[PDB]
């Protein structure tokens, strides 16, 4: 029920907006860096959202019943900090420690701050995360909390934003409000549309949003705009001036990310303070408590894998099966896929648990941001899937997911040349490089159905950015159903006493190495075959012990480019160990179409390459 | 001047459309994979563009005067192949070799085909490349060629597409036509908007395009729609049915990427052939020849760098200077930046050569695709810039740029923790991993102004995906102006006879290593300091020779994560060389805000870390 504010409450919201301006200035001048002009356009929005519109516990920002706020334009972090001091949560003196190594008031928001769920310094990402939170609130939590996301106008140039706009209308997120700070300017020039407010409205409405144009420096218009619920996602299109309230700087270029020098900070602050009618702060209003409790326990498969050694299944299929199976053990599991469900086999999970499958369409960036938003406050355990090749489309979302300390799971299918005829646009050959460079990642590369099921289970229970690399060829099951698997533990899958070299393969190259072993025993050459299971962390101890047993010789073979994959991880793990050598076989250039087996041979990673190389 | 077609010409265009259907079916049934239904919705579009609308030389697809065609929905490649056989360029029998290892008719289009400029299997990328070609045609070539881009409807879910739509209207590309194959279905379900043609029109018009709704199976409507030029980019929004002309399969789900079995191919083909009135083919019409000639020669700086050893300059500034300097040696140089020109210093080039600077706004994906399109047919030599961190936003464009065999240059600033206070959202710590995994890449990491200028020059003249990693701290010039630099050649920058370890640093860590050397000489410990210059290719010979002179010991130190960077490249280069050890210092987790020097120490890659580590 909207509380229509009185003059006094209005004046108090303007005072708050002006305190927020002063604090953004003081903090950024104290730091000697930061973005006070990007704070100042948003001052009334922030005052009205925090001190009229939103409902939350000011002493418990993470509380699951709270309305959510996402500062998509993350460089306005000082004003986010200022509202949490205004609300009583942060000590006001701490605001001056902005950007110090002794402070958690960092340059852009990050989840070490209790009041931040997702990191947003890379622009255009916050609305997708907000859609994750709103989808969760409407469809999973089924709670009364709302979700507010504040975007810049330059920021609306990112296509990820429009993926999120489209998602919100497809999924009728009428508990989501995007506020667009139309302050006319980006970093280095005006934003393309400047103050053509009608064209912003037309773009938003075309994408299915209820779009209201407001004076973004009118606390009353903002109250009223935020005050009416809709049956659609709502876009509050706020006409503002960058550096609003800073005389001489308002509506000027050349001021993005430039702090006021001390002397100018003092003079400006004094003018702003002269506008403030009372020192007295507005109190936050707490939320209706209707979010459900969510069970934190380990999630276990309801049975062991039911594959038999010798049956043939592609690991992309085993993943679909395993994920559906795991869906029956826990209600927190959700799946997301970008119009590839029939190829990744996440369609299996959709069939069994339709209410927990989210079709994300051809929009990999948004898919990862939705998963990040679903995983905030630990509300769900998301598994996203597409071809591994197209996770490169989402690399900045993935990179920011680690800075957001996010626990999301990603399964990318169709890795390497062994997909065959589609050709290199669909071949993931850089995904091990990409995910290894993500600092909280665990990289699972299961070589058969059993290993795949076990990887799914382990990933579910593993913090950080979990990636699972699946494959298209239907290889044999080689592991017993009851084989134990752990993160960082490899498997020796063929061995003797008289082994000439330890061959390390994974997925299709593991089975190529076992086939090479068969060619090689014909000439009385034994090879140890090792399946790493995780590429990160790598089982160094096992790899070294195997190498010492095989006259120091390691051969790595991978359906991936040479850089940042299995061969380099292994090289980096063993370099400088006496008596250890490492030969690396990998894919040396952009591939082409052909049969899976023909490509494996053309690119020097099939049984014959492996066999030919061991002899050397 | 529009040639209004007669009935006979119309009937001939329908016959062509039906031949194109048959060939797409025969080719994909012969291959046993491919997407005949995705071909069949587009058959009339393709017939009308190739045999009425476009002007090109049928025997010279790369000819610089030709209209350009971009198949953004690249999985429809068999019908692209079919039109080039229909035009006389390809032998008709070759179409049956679709997807064979003995054929260049690969699963998706790739530039080994004379008729393909850019690879487009990753959806949503072709319109940005097309904008590159149209911007070049309108503003650089100043030619009469037009650019036509065919997109799927599921494909319009990619935000990159909307970045391109916005770019085309900002830059008034009235020589660009996007054709939207609205066949209602994506891969695994209907496309979100299905056949709500009005909402597609509203979205296109909101983004500044002239939008015409047509029956996509009406050759006459298509002729007419393509026949009128506009003052805006034009979107032909074509209502079609997926699998059009395949009885029983038209407008059905469960058929994306599924070939017709032989028996069904034969029956369908016979029905389609029964609709064809004459065997006689339409001839292509050649273009007005008004594209200018473009000089192919090496590009040399007009003077040597004018830095003095001991002056301090950040390499991000040296890059702006060098690029502007290089702009004066050659007219082919163009620069592109995503609203970061004041931080990357590409604003220097904009100042001196405004007509050759393209502001791409906050839209990194599109920026890379525009550069790819500008570089097609070798019309320009593009240099794109942004913070290196935000090149992760464009990784799939970069990856596809290598599959497109594209010669583009990318300079990413603000690498590592040494940027200081903004915090990790802006810190590139995975960019060496990312660009090393691109198979045609050269990775330049210049450590001072002179090396930066030389890298710019070399990159300009180097094929493939050239990346230049620039930095924020203002370090000393350490190289003489006349120092020679080459791809793959490193530099020993401090040495003696009595050196304990070869320390390898780059950018800020090179200068940290030289400062460590100063701390270490105090205790009579000499260290060899080596500056790799290129990370890929790496100067293995020099690194090994240096290590043998320093008792086998290598220490690598880098402002980058441990995976896929300098330390792993060096490890992979030296592993198994007798007497060689490698200690690696890198950044071990997501960073945080602080001063540049404080972060370098917190993360164990500053002078004291290096000094402390050598002693071990
Ligand atoms: C993905 C990405 N690209 C580029 C940047 C560099 N950058 C930071 S803020 C900014 C300008 C943002 O302008 P706008 O969205 O209008 O916000 P304002 O400060 O005007 O409110 C840019 C280009 C970034 N942070 N993220
Ligand atoms: C970036 C990216 N993500 C996912 C895919 C997987 N894929 C290939 S075709 C396709 C469906 C494309 O549907 P649409 O754009 O409507 O084209 P249509 O075949 O119907 O003409 C998908 C999801 C891809 N090729 N590229
Ligand atoms: Ca702005
Ligand atoms: Ca479609
Ligand atoms: Na996990
Ligand atoms: Na180059």
Coordinates of N, CA, C and O in Angstrom, one line a residue, chain A residues 3-92:
Chain A
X3 N 2.7 4.6 0.6 CA 2.6 5.7 1.5 C 2.9 7.0 0.8 O 4.1 7.3 0.6
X4 N 1.9 7.8 0.4 CA 2.1 9.1 -0.3 C 2.8 10.1 0.7 O 2.2 10.5 1.7
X5 N 4.1 10.5 0.3 CA 4.8 11.3 1.3 C 4.3 12.7 1.5 O 3.8 13.3 0.5
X6 N 4.4 13.2 2.7 CA 4.1 14.7 2.9 C 5.3 15.6 2.5 O 6.4 15.1 2.2
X7 N 5.1 16.9 2.5 CA 6.2 17.9 2.3 C 7.4 17.6 3.1 O 8.6 17.8 2.6
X8 N 7.2 17.3 4.4 CA 8.3 17.2 5.3 C 9.1 16.0 4.9 O 10.3 16.0 4.9
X9 N 8.4 14.9 4.6 CA 9.1 13.7 4.2 C 9.9 13.9 2.9 O 11.0 13.5 2.7
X10 N 9.2 14.6 1.9 CA 9.9 15.1 0.7 C 11.1 15.9 1.0 O 12.2 15.6 0.5
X11 N 11.0 16.9 1.9 CA 12.2 17.7 2.2 C 13.3 16.8 2.9 O 14.4 17.0 2.5
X12 N 12.9 15.9 3.8 CA 13.8 14.9 4.3 C 14.5 14.1 3.3 O 15.7 13.7 3.4
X13 N 13.8 13.6 2.3 CA 14.4 12.9 1.1 C 15.4 13.7 0.3 O 16.5 13.2 0.0
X14 N 15.1 15.0 0.0 CA 16.1 15.9 -0.6 C 17.3 16.1 0.3 O 18.4 16.1 -0.1
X15 N 17.1 16.3 1.7 CA 18.2 16.4 2.6 C 19.2 15.2 2.6 O 20.4 15.3 2.5
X16 N 18.5 14.0 2.5 CA 19.2 12.8 2.4 C 20.0 12.8 1.1 O 21.2 12.5 1.1
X17 N 19.3 13.0 0.0 CA 20.0 13.1 -1.3 C 21.3 14.0 -1.3 O 22.4 13.6 -1.7
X18 N 21.1 15.2 -0.7 CA 22.2 16.1 -0.5 C 23.3 15.6 0.5 O 24.5 15.7 0.2
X19 N 22.9 15.0 1.6 CA 23.9 14.3 2.4 C 24.7 13.2 1.6 O 25.9 13.0 1.7
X20 N 23.9 12.5 0.7 CA 24.6 11.5 -0.1 C 25.6 12.1 -1.0 O 26.7 11.5 -1.2
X21 N 25.3 13.2 -1.6 CA 26.2 14.0 -2.5 C 27.4 14.4 -1.7 O 28.6 14.2 -2.1
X22 N 27.2 15.0 -0.5 CA 28.4 15.4 0.3 C 29.3 14.2 0.6 O 30.5 14.2 0.4
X23 N 28.7 13.1 1.1 CA 29.5 11.9 1.4 C 30.3 11.4 0.2 O 31.4 11.1 0.3
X24 N 29.6 11.2 -1.0 CA 30.3 10.8 -2.2 C 31.5 11.7 -2.6 O 32.6 11.2 -3.0
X25 N 31.3 13.0 -2.4 CA 32.4 13.9 -2.6 C 33.5 13.7 -1.5 O 34.7 13.6 -1.9
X26 N 33.2 13.8 -0.2 CA 34.2 13.7 0.8 C 35.0 12.4 0.6 O 36.3 12.5 0.7
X27 N 34.4 11.3 0.3 CA 35.0 10.0 0.2 C 36.0 9.9 -1.0 O 37.1 9.4 -0.9
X28 N 35.6 10.5 -2.1 CA 36.3 10.4 -3.3 C 37.5 11.4 -3.3 O 38.6 11.1 -3.8
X29 N 37.2 12.5 -2.7 CA 38.4 13.5 -2.5 C 39.4 12.9 -1.4 O 40.7 13.1 -1.7
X30 N 38.9 12.2 -0.4 CA 39.8 11.6 0.6 C 40.7 10.5 -0.1 O 41.9 10.4 0.2
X31 N 40.1 9.7 -0.9 CA 40.8 8.7 -1.7 C 41.7 9.2 -2.8 O 42.8 8.6 -3.0
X32 N 41.3 10.3 -3.4 CA 42.1 10.9 -4.5 C 41.7 10.2 -5.9 O 42.3 10.3 -6.9
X33 N 40.6 9.3 -5.8 CA 40.1 8.7 -7.1 C 38.6 8.4 -6.8 O 38.2 8.4 -5.7
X34 N 37.9 8.0 -7.9 CA 36.5 7.7 -7.8 C 35.7 8.6 -8.6 O 36.2 9.4 -9.4
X35 N 34.3 8.6 -8.5 CA 33.4 9.0 -9.5 C 32.3 9.9 -8.9 O 31.0 9.5 -9.0
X36 N 32.6 11.0 -8.3 CA 31.6 11.7 -7.6 C 30.5 12.2 -8.5 O 29.3 12.2 -8.2
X37 N 30.8 12.5 -9.8 CA 29.7 13.0 -10.7 C 28.7 11.9 -11.0 O 27.6 12.3 -11.2
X38 N 29.2 10.7 -11.0 CA 28.3 9.5 -11.3 C 27.4 9.2 -10.1 O 26.3 8.6 -10.2
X39 N 27.9 9.5 -8.9 CA 27.1 9.5 -7.7 C 26.0 10.5 -7.7 O 24.8 10.3 -7.3
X40 N 26.4 11.8 -8.1 CA 25.5 12.9 -7.9 C 24.3 12.9 -8.8 O 23.2 13.4 -8.3
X41 N 24.3 12.3 -10.0 CA 23.1 12.2 -10.8 C 22.1 11.3 -10.1 O 20.9 11.3 -10.5
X42 N 22.6 10.4 -9.3 CA 21.7 9.3 -8.8 C 21.3 9.6 -7.3 O 20.6 8.7 -6.7
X43 N 21.6 10.7 -6.8 CA 21.4 11.0 -5.4 C 19.9 10.9 -4.9 O 19.6 10.3 -3.8
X44 N 19.1 11.6 -5.6 CA 17.6 11.5 -5.3 C 17.0 10.0 -5.5 O 16.3 9.5 -4.7
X45 N 17.4 9.3 -6.6 CA 17.1 7.9 -6.7 C 17.5 7.1 -5.5 O 16.7 6.3 -5.0
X46 N 18.7 7.3 -5.1 CA 19.2 6.5 -4.0 C 18.5 6.8 -2.7 O 18.1 5.9 -1.9
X47 N 18.2 8.1 -2.5 CA 17.5 8.6 -1.3 C 16.1 8.0 -1.2 O 15.7 7.5 -0.2
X48 N 15.4 8.1 -2.4 CA 14.0 7.6 -2.4 C 14.0 6.1 -2.3 O 13.1 5.6 -1.6
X49 N 14.8 5.4 -3.1 CA 14.7 3.9 -2.9 C 15.0 3.5 -1.5 O 14.3 2.6 -0.9
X50 N 16.1 4.0 -0.9 CA 16.5 3.5 0.5 C 15.7 4.1 1.6 O 15.6 3.4 2.7
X51 N 15.0 5.2 1.4 CA 14.4 5.9 2.6 C 12.9 6.2 2.3 O 12.3 6.8 3.2
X52 N 12.3 5.6 1.2 CA 10.9 5.6 1.1 C 10.4 4.3 0.5 O 9.5 3.6 1.1
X53 N 10.9 3.9 -0.6 CA 10.4 2.7 -1.4 C 10.7 1.3 -0.9 O 9.8 0.5 -0.7
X54 N 11.9 1.0 -0.7 CA 12.4 -0.3 -0.3 C 12.1 -0.7 1.1 O 11.9 0.2 2.0
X55 N 12.0 -2.0 1.4 CA 11.8 -2.5 2.7 C 12.9 -3.4 3.0 O 13.1 -4.3 2.2
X56 N 13.7 -3.2 4.1 CA 14.8 -4.1 4.4 C 15.1 -4.0 5.8 O 14.8 -2.9 6.4
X57 N 15.9 -4.9 6.3 CA 16.5 -4.8 7.7 C 17.8 -4.0 7.6 O 18.8 -4.6 7.1
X58 N 17.9 -2.9 8.2 CA 19.1 -2.0 8.1 C 20.3 -2.6 8.8 O 21.4 -2.4 8.4
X59 N 20.0 -3.5 9.8 CA 21.1 -4.1 10.5 C 21.4 -5.5 9.9 O 22.3 -6.2 10.5
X60 N 20.7 -6.0 8.9 CA 20.9 -7.3 8.4 C 20.7 -7.2 6.9 O 19.6 -7.6 6.4
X61 N 21.7 -6.6 6.1 CA 21.5 -6.4 4.7 C 21.3 -7.7 3.9 O 20.5 -7.7 2.9
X62 N 21.9 -8.8 4.3 CA 21.7 -10.1 3.6 C 20.4 -10.9 3.9 O 20.2 -11.9 3.3
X63 N 19.6 -10.3 4.8 CA 18.4 -11.0 5.3 C 17.5 -11.4 4.0 O 17.3 -10.6 3.1
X64 N 17.0 -12.7 4.1 CA 16.4 -13.2 2.9 C 15.1 -12.6 2.5 O 14.6 -12.8 1.4
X65 N 14.5 -11.9 3.5 CA 13.2 -11.2 3.3 C 13.3 -9.8 2.7 O 12.3 -9.2 2.3
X66 N 14.6 -9.3 2.7 CA 14.8 -7.9 2.2 C 14.4 -7.7 0.7 O 14.7 -8.6 -0.1
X67 N 13.9 -6.5 0.3 CA 14.0 -6.1 -1.1 C 15.5 -6.1 -1.4 O 16.4 -5.9 -0.6
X68 N 15.8 -6.4 -2.7 CA 17.2 -6.4 -3.3 C 17.4 -5.1 -4.0 O 16.5 -4.6 -4.8
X69 N 18.6 -4.6 -3.9 CA 19.1 -3.5 -4.7 C 20.4 -3.9 -5.4 O 21.3 -4.4 -4.7
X70 N 20.4 -3.7 -6.7 CA 21.6 -3.9 -7.5 C 22.1 -2.6 -8.1 O 21.4 -2.0 -8.9
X71 N 23.3 -2.2 -7.8 CA 23.9 -1.0 -8.4 C 24.7 -1.5 -9.6 O 25.9 -1.9 -9.6
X72 N 24.0 -1.6 -10.7 CA 24.6 -2.0 -12.0 C 25.8 -1.1 -12.4 O 26.8 -1.6 -13.0
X73 N 25.5 0.2 -12.2 CA 26.6 1.2 -12.6 C 27.5 1.3 -11.3 O 27.4 2.2 -10.5
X74 N 28.4 0.2 -11.2 CA 29.1 -0.1 -10.0 C 30.1 1.0 -9.5 O 30.4 1.2 -8.4
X75 N 30.5 1.8 -10.5 CA 31.4 3.0 -10.2 C 30.8 4.0 -9.3 O 31.5 4.9 -8.8
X76 N 29.5 4.0 -9.1 CA 28.8 4.8 -8.2 C 28.8 4.2 -6.7 O 28.1 4.7 -5.8
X77 N 29.7 3.3 -6.5 CA 29.9 2.6 -5.2 C 29.9 3.6 -4.0 O 29.2 3.3 -3.0
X78 N 30.6 4.7 -4.1 CA 30.6 5.6 -2.8 C 29.2 6.0 -2.4 O 29.0 6.1 -1.1
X79 N 28.2 6.2 -3.3 CA 26.9 6.5 -2.8 C 26.1 5.3 -2.2 O 25.3 5.5 -1.4
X80 N 26.4 4.1 -2.8 CA 25.9 2.9 -2.1 C 26.4 2.8 -0.6 O 25.7 2.5 0.3
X81 N 27.7 3.1 -0.5 CA 28.3 3.1 0.9 C 27.6 4.2 1.7 O 27.2 3.8 2.8
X82 N 27.5 5.4 1.2 CA 26.8 6.5 1.9 C 25.3 6.1 2.3 O 25.0 6.3 3.5
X83 N 24.6 5.3 1.5 CA 23.2 5.0 2.0 C 23.3 3.9 3.1 O 22.4 4.0 4.0
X84 N 24.3 3.1 3.2 CA 24.4 2.1 4.2 C 24.9 2.7 5.5 O 24.5 2.2 6.6
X85 N 25.7 3.8 5.4 CA 26.0 4.6 6.6 C 24.7 5.4 7.1 O 24.3 5.4 8.3
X86 N 24.0 6.0 6.1 CA 22.7 6.7 6.4 C 21.7 5.8 7.1 O 21.0 6.2 8.0
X87 N 21.7 4.5 6.6 CA 20.7 3.6 7.2 C 21.2 3.1 8.6 O 20.4 2.4 9.3
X88 N 22.4 3.4 9.0 CA 22.9 3.0 10.3 C 23.7 1.7 10.3 O 24.2 1.3 11.4
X89 N 23.9 1.1 9.2 CA 24.7 -0.1 9.2 C 26.2 0.1 9.2 O 26.9 -0.6 10.0
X90 N 26.6 1.0 8.4 CA 28.1 1.4 8.4 C 28.3 2.6 9.2 O 27.4 3.4 9.3
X91 N 29.4 2.6 9.9 CA 29.9 3.8 10.6 C 30.2 4.9 9.6 O 30.9 4.7 8.6
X92 N 29.7 6.1 9.9 CA 29.9 7.2 9.0 C 31.4 7.6 8.8 O 31.8 8.0 7.6

